[PDB]
Amino acid sequence: MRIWVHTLTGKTITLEVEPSDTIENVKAKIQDKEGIPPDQQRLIWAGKQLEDGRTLSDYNINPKLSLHLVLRLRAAGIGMQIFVHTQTGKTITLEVEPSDTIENVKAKIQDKEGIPPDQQRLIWAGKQLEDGRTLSDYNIGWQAPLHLVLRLR
Ligand SMILES: [Cu+2]
Ligand SMILES: [Cu+2]
Ligand SMILES: [Cu+2]
Ligand SMILES: [Cu+2]
C-alpha cells in the first residue's frame, strides 16, 4: 500500500502503490513527485535490480513489513541514442550523431529491420524529416531523448 524509496540525497520518498503495479509504474510515480525520468532510474531491493515489466507481486515481498527501495540514477550517456517507434508497437533504438543525415537514419533502420529507406517516413513533432538534412538542421532539444515515429509509404 505505502512504500518508501531512498535517494542519494538522503531524502526519502513515500509512494502509494498496490501489488499489481508494475515497476515501470513505480518509476512513473517517482517521476511525478521528483521530475526524474524513468529511463534514468534503477530501483534496488534486497540486492536485486527491479525489472520494468514486472509487478511488485512478481517479487517475493513480505507485506507485513514496510517495503523500502533504493533509487540509483543510471546514465543518459556513453553515446547518443535515439528511439524510433513503429506501427507494430516495437521501439527501435539507434545510435546517431547530430551531423547524421535523415537518410542515414533511414539507412540505420534498414540495417536493423530490413525496411527500405524508400518506404520510410520519419515524423518528429508533426514534421516529416527531410532526407537531405541533418538532425542538427532541426531544432532538437538535446537534453531530452529524441523519439521519432516511423510510418510506411
Ligand atoms: Cu529504508
Ligand atoms: Cu554518422
Ligand atoms: Cu545497409
Ligand atoms: Cu516515444
Numbering used by the authors: 1 to 153
The authors write:
Af1 and Af2 were independently evolved against the same target 67B89. Attempts to crystallise the purified Af1:7B8 complex resulted in crystals of Af1 alone that diffracted to 2.2 Å, allowing elucidation of the Af1 structure in the unbound state. The superposition of Af1 with the Af2:7B8 complex shows that the two Ub domains have different orientations. Solvent-exposed W142 of Af1 is not involved in domain contacts between Ub-N and Ub-C, as observed for the corresponding Y141 in Af2. Af1 Ub-N und Ub-C display almost identical overall structures (Cα RMSD 0.2 Å). The very similar structures of the Ub-N domains of Af1 and Af2 (Cα RMSD 1.5 Å) both display a −2 register shift in β5. However, there are differences in the conformations of the α2β5 loops. Presumably, the −2 register shift of Af1 Ub-C is incompatible with the binding mode observed in the Af2:7B8 complex, which involves a −4 shift in Ub-C, and would result in clashes of Af1 Ub-C with the target.
The structure of ubiquitin (Ub), a 76 amino acid signalling protein conserved among all eukaryotes, features a single five-stranded β-sheet enclosing a short α-helix. The crystal structures of two EDB-specific Affilin variants reveal a striking structural plasticity of the ubiquitin scaffold, characterised by β-strand slippage, leading to different negative register shifts of the β5 strands. This process recruits amino acid residues from β5 towards the N-terminus to an adjacent loop region and subsequent residues into β5, respectively, remodeling the binding interface and leading to target specificity and affinity.
